[PDB]
A paper describes a structure:
The transformation of UDP-D-GlcNAc in UDP-L-FucNAc requires three enzymes ([name], CapF and CapG) in [name]. The two reactions catalysed by [name] are the C-4/C-6 dehydration and the C-5 epimerization of the UDP–sugar. Herein we present the first crystal structure of [name], revealing that this enzyme forms a stable and functional homo-hexamer.
Two structures correspond to the binary complex of the enzyme with coenzyme (wild-type protein and inactive mutein K126E). The coenzyme engages in a dense network of non-covalent interactions with the enzyme, including polar and van der Waals forces, and hydrophobic interactions. The A–B and A–C surface areas of [name] in complex with coenzyme are significantly smaller than that of [name] with substrate analogue bound. The A–B and A–C surface areas calculated from the coordinates of [name] with coenzyme bound are reduced by 60 and 65%, respectively. The reason is the dynamic disorder occurring at these two contact regions. On the contrary, the A–F interaction surface remains essentially unchanged regardless of the ligand present in the crystal.
Author numbering:
A (entry chain A), B (entry chain A), C (entry chain A), D (entry chain A), E (entry chain A), F (entry chain A): 2 to 168, 193 to 239, 260 to 285, 305 to 334
The structure:
């Protein structure tokens, strides 16, 4: 990060911001926020009042606007997506345009600009997808994986990261926004080209959650078979029973309540 | 089919040909075979020696070549795909270009030409896909489904059909090529706009198959929940445990051998 | 508005929302909100809880996504723009892509769908522009004006509306958001094809404004020459000293304070 | 100009030719004339009978034809435009395609080919534009200015030049074609990346002109504020009362007549 | 021609003008001149001073600019081409873009606008072509011919016209500009969809020509075989020894001199 | 061929395969087969069972799929075409898309990837073409020839090869598939940039052929004039009576029968 330039596509999102407040008071050269929305960008600019933040208008659908932003960049965190389920169900083609083709553009541009590392953000919904958001995401995973095979890593390294949700008796994964940034920083440092990184996470029942108030699949069977264990993460390396919310360290109110406390968002009656 | 024109995209395939030998000696006006390959087209033309067969060079990636072929058509059987697994795994983007965007083009063109019915051919691999072929297919299903919502049916009716394979102890579905045409003819007649039709099929263990020589999922849990039963077919209608090869009428050698006999292909030592 | 369908491109904006809360409890058939951002769209959907609101994902840069949304629409309020000054100064091409070409797409699509009336929202900055936002806006005005000449009005009527800002001794125009909707409703009813409508508005000095706390050009000289007076609006009809903030009814604290009161936004210490 | 290659887009114009007869008997390597019209190109080729002149068919709307011409070029004088007022008023989009997007293509191609300097020819009409020609030109100025910020100058230097007209009591600027080439040669040598250069020019009243037979704005107020004085030129450098024809050295018949004499065009009754 | 609208693409050319001075003092509704060059268009506009002449900026490479011009047109004379030999030899792709794809655009647009008749101007060089101009022209002939098969004539009729040159012992065809317009008017009236019309023309030796100062192939062998004779024209109708300058009525000085006289161009020492 | 990579576009064809069985048991690094059809590719893969064979899905119409395949390639044999006559006659535009534009893409991509040599396969039908296949081929020849002028050879060398047919009294050329590979290997080694190579070949009468069972033009007059003789080949170098089947070594049954024998295809009653 000594004089290094980071580009975050979809930089104005929940995640882009979390990577920001993290990376900012650091000694990285420049953090390029790249997205469509001048309003969110304007809100970010004013508050942080920090010169390392560069704002780029553009969208991942358009190769020429990606290139401009991509010039002389070292690391890309590709977070730009259509990520809501109904919006993708009614407009699957838009899901395609952004999630899949948007990713081809980011990758081609990255390679052309001799970017060192690209990390594509993905979702547990891509593991056995049933909805268009998840499906398009699965397809984005295959896309970056195929690209990684063809590209020498010392030129450009290309990897991805699935996560479940951040921030009645059935179960769901528990990740904070702080936890999400971690997975990516982890991928940055340790991923080899083609890898999908997934964070090991506690997974509360949705019923026991609502009490602390005063099944999600992260790896397909086949992915768990092929994978590699890194401690708090599995690593699915590119080729050439299952990891889900019902079978990690499941928690009860006693623990559900504690993790909540740390969300600087939830602890708000001040 | 009185003076009706049928267009088959990917008309030169295993299926296109099966629909052909079926529909030909009929009284349909014209059967438009639309595909990329002049060689296969040439082989078809010579043999059948039948005036109702019209050959169109074009590909589904290209809207202008679709339109030409689409002019004054009544029914489309959309069979054009990249359907092999490794080829889609190494070239997912091509899978996207053909399977998903190819389908947007066919649909837009169909609608513009006031086509009456479009049937998109799909695959059991689209149900909980893990591979890019299947994934892109799943995405194609969402695409035609989304399009069907926005389009009045009396303008253009849009439906699809999944099938397993045609022609060690684990199980797999058994459909002939004759069985495959049936499913489509069925969809033609009875599908409402947005439907996915799936044929009920016997499903032998792969081990007991190889003996007659002298798990596949067709519906996701959620799809089986929502579906409607038509006898030899389920119907999944558009919104706004599972049906698989391990739990249909499973067969043993006695029955496996008999079905084989009818394949005009297998019974060949003449 | 009896069974009439309205489409608002950039429907998620300050203005789109103002037109919404206005048109909603009415008897219009359907109000299509068309924009890029699923998050804003999601926030709107939840709150209003109103069936006439239809949400369309798409962007004006893309003709195919415009068409989908444009199907069977009667009236379009074209509000989609890159409207901040610095963002347009650093990324003029994006300004071009959205403000000018976005507008060609909306117009072509409108015409093709036999839309009855399209209203393009514009800005005082388009009158003698010096910045890229204003310049691109000026260009958008010429674009819709040129299109209006070529199109019979009984097919599709095409007009636009400039306004100054809504919501030290130099002067600036004073329009509320309520005032802005008015101008558009006015254009809807009374504009002929090609017209630019501009609202007559009081124009306080920025110095006397900040006191009530307890030059903008709307028409170029040449435009004032050619224009037509409608009472609270000027009408600039298509061809084949100046109207500015220093010379309307200028106001002092006594009046500045009163208009403020009505902004349901400013009167907030509750 | 020792073995240097110059490309003139719109090379067949009034200006392209003036730069030609100037640069020709020099020792520059090659002067590439790039334009759409084979007829004008053919007329030029025949007459000059000079090997340094290379003729390229292409147009600035098309990136692939720009690249071909752009290969191994050192300096570009970008003169290709739709420059007549009514033609731009009726066909603003064409104005956009050529003047603005044509310029993005030329710039991108220039950069890719590691061109040393690009000079975009502009017009006084871009200063407070009211017409589409002027507006599109203003937009072209912002476009090249934005591009210059993002590009290191030692890679590719990007600048522009406004001029009034060349060759009843109100006033207008007086530049010859010889004067116009000068401004560009000046920009070539002295412009820094992002600069707009404007020539200081005498400005006769149109009434006193017609007698020698035997208001134009070059800088907006704001541009005059920010500018830098170079003697016979102002320099407007890129960010991060007015200069007009009514207030330069205005001339009377005595001087109007003399300047005329030098136009090798006007002195023609031979 | 009662209230009929004619569009001439490449309307600013030698031919466009000849069709103009012909059709003008008539009672046709509107003659749309469509081309790239505002300068030629401006020169035409001023001189003829005639309201039936409408000037359209656009180029045939661009479908959207064709459509605008094509709206409500009855007859198209497609004369837009890259027609010089060396320019096509060095830039064959441009030849392709204009001559072949330009023609696909004109045809598609014509059909969409329910144009009654389109006439594509072609050249003797398309008969056994050896150069890129001729080759691209040959290809344009096949293109319009293929399109004519697929299109019902009562919708849109599509035909073409080859001619040799207008205005040492080897031979060449002799057509005036007046003769060229004739061939087209002839095609307009009598061509069936798919026809190539060729004018029968006297063909002087180039040696005997230069004396009156005080081999070209129009039909390939195969084309002469298939053709139909109409008096002063052959008609080559669409499928599903040779006609050349060495064997028409060849002329000697006595006749060469006389035909010359009529060229209002040659008889100029006044 | 020491660690050299060969790409064959249209690699699945009659020719692609002939170049394969030739080059395979060699010591070349990698032979990239690039084409549209996964089925043919799959058939090739299985049989040869040889690691040097790499299979790429893509088509020449699409630049992005060409680039992927083109990365780090040393030699390209461009064999991808629409080569049947009727298919090109009915769909000339497809002929254009593949044969001409497909070739521009392959060339641009080749150059960008710093490919050493590209050989475009052509046909005797391009010499005085009368059909769209031949015409489009002629145009492809001009296209690669034009490109070769603009490109330094030490960067990328670009050449082509015409051949007649491989494998009543009128005559036709006789080349085997083995003969066809030869011509290309010859071009590989000896062609200079811009050359068209043509093989000297015996040319039997079609009547005397059918007896051994127990006019084609390769160079236009003008091409024979300009050409250079290399023994068993003519070489047509780029600029800045005829060679045909009726006048090579014509053969009678005695020789016709013998050449046949060697076709490992014809000698099949085993
Ligand atoms: N619950 C979760 O947070 C969660 C769970 C699993 C996976 N993920 C994955 O993590 C990634 C980012 O998540 P998030 O929490 O940051 O979502 P988010 O807050 O909605 O951020 C997405 C950002 O993408 C931008 N964007 C959308 N389309 C774009 C385009 N075409 N070009 C450029 N930018 C575009 C949007 O900015 P503009 O509107 O300004 O363009 C938005 O700020 C997603 O890909 C998602 O699949 C998230
Ligand atoms: N085992 C099975 O047969 C099976 C099982 C499940 C589902 N399905 C589904 O049924 C459909 C058709 O199956 P099939 O047995 O006919 O496969 P197939 O025999 O490979 O037929 C596919 C045809 O599509 C054509 N095609 C490919 N890309 C095209 C493009 N871009 N434009 C136009 N045509 C194109 C090909 O013809 P050209 O090469 O001539 O263009 C080919 O003949 C597929 O979508 C598949 O997913 C099949
Ligand atoms: N101060 C003012 O309010 C003011 C003054 C003068 C003139 N105007 C004019 O009035 C118009 C609208 O003003 P506003 O107050 O509503 O601004 P706004 O609140 O920023 O609304 C603009 C909307 O456009 C949408 N949008 C942007 N790019 C788009 C694209 N490519 N496709 C589809 N939608 C897109 C955005 O939604 P998504 O991000 O969801 O796509 C945004 O909600 C503007 O054109 C402006 O020039 C406004
Ligand atoms: N009165 C003046 O002369 C004056 C005053 C102020 C500013 N300027 C500026 O100076 C510049 C050039 O002026 P000028 O006097 O040379 O005008 P001009 O004589 O009309 O020259 C413009 C040239 O541009 C070429 N062109 C147009 N569109 C093109 C395209 N898409 N691709 C490639 N070439 C194209 C035309 O050549 P083809 O038709 O052969 O393509 C034409 O020869 C203009 O940008 C103008 O704004 C001129
Ligand atoms: N000697 C002859 O005259 C002769 C002989 C045989 C055949 N022909 C055929 O007759 C046709 C016309 O001949 P002509 O004598 O009129 O040639 P011309 O005088 O050069 O006319 C061609 C016109 O086409 C226009 N043009 C070129 N590219 C264009 C584009 N992309 N979009 C729109 N317009 C375009 C040009 O106008 P702008 O520059 O204003 O766009 C030009 O005025 C040609 O197709 C030619 O093959 C002519
Ligand atoms: N009789 C002859 O053999 C003969 C005579 C004279 C000249 N030639 C020339 O030699 C060349 C090759 O001849 P051939 O005998 O190999 O013909 P072929 O056997 O038909 O081979 C052509 C190959 O091109 C591929 N192809 C077609 N369109 C493509 C596209 N858009 N992208 C990528 N690949 C594409 C096809 O593969 P997919 O279907 O898998 O894409 C096909 O295997 C041709 O250009 C032809 O003009 C041949």
């Amino acid at each position: 990060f000594d004089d290094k330039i980071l580009l975050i596509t979809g930089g104005t999102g929940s995640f882009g911001n979390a990577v920001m407040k993290r990376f900012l008071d650091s000694n990285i050269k420049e953090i390029r926020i790249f997205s469509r929305d001048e309003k969110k960008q304007d809100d970010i600019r004013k508050k942080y009042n920090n010169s390392k933040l560069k704002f780029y208008i553009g969208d991942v659908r358009d190769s020429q606007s990606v290139e401009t932003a991509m010039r002389d960049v070292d690391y890309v965190f590709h977070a730009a997506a259509l990520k809501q389920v109904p919006s993708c169900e009614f407009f699957p083609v838009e899901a395609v345009k952004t999630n899949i083709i948007g990713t081809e553009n980011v990758l081609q541009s990255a390679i052309h600009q001799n970017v060192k590392k690209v990390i594509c953000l993905s979702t547990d919904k891509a593991a056995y997808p049933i909805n268009a958001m998840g499906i398009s995401k699965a397809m984005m995973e295959k896309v970056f994986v195929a690209k990684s095979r063809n590209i020498r890593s010392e030129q450009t390294l290309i990897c991805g990261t699935r996560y479940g949700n951040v921030m009645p008796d059935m179960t769901r994964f528990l990740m904070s926004l702080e936890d999400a940034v971690e997975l990516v920083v982890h991928a940055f440092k340790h991923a080899e080209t083609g890898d999908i990184m997934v964070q090991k996470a506690p997974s509360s029942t949705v019923g026991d959650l609502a009490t602390a108030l005063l099944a999600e699949t992260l790896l397909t069977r086949e992915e768990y078979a092929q994978c590699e264990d890194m401690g708090d993460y599995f690593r699915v390396p590119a080729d050439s029973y299952e990891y889900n919310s019902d079978n990690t360290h499941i928690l009860t109110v006693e623990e559900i309540k504690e993790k909540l406390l740390t969300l600087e968002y939830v602890r708000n009656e001040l």
